[PDB]
Amino acid sequence: GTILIDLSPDDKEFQSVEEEMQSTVREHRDGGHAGGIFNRYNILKIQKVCNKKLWERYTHRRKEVSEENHNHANERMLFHGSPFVNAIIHKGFDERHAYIGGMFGAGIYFAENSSKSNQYVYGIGGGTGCPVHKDRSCYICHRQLLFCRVTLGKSFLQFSAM
């Protein structure tokens, strides 16, 4: 059901999404251990994910949540990095994509910092790095992140010690 539409680097939509990626890189307290050492990305491709059944399933839940939160979906665009990105764009998010040991409970996690989600493209803590070179800071292998539409509704604010 899923179709991928390539955006042109000359399209303002491509440039806007790249801008969100580049401008939300930060330094991480692990010195780069998990996601590698870098200040910016080389963006190779940005594709729109089109799936009618997944979108209708998303918008149906969004409507429900909206009606439960003084008519406010509280919808954000947030990054998600994961070894299972191929399963996510074809089948959607579900509990197998949930971080069981996350600081805020077993659920599906998203980041405002693109570089935070980059720490998880090869797994938790960067796993063993890229499959070809076993290098968490690989500058050669291609990585993939998702930039997702996320309905937060009424969000419980939890301050962390990070």
Partner: protein, 47 residues
């Protein structure tokens, strides 16, 4: 998957020590996110 806190649809995890670290968010239902853009990229070695 866990449940969200009662009366809430998600959790906002907000770093309180590193002022430059942005927020992290958790949802507990797959239907509350849509993977809109797939971004293929490399990290670049600092010059």
């Amino acid at each position: 998957m866990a449940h969200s806190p009662p009366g809430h649809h998600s959790v906002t995890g907000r770093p309180s020590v590193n002022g430059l670290a942005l927020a992290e968010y958790v949802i507990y239902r797959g239907e509350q996110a849509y993977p809109e853009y797939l971004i293929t990229y490399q990290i670049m070695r600092p010059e």
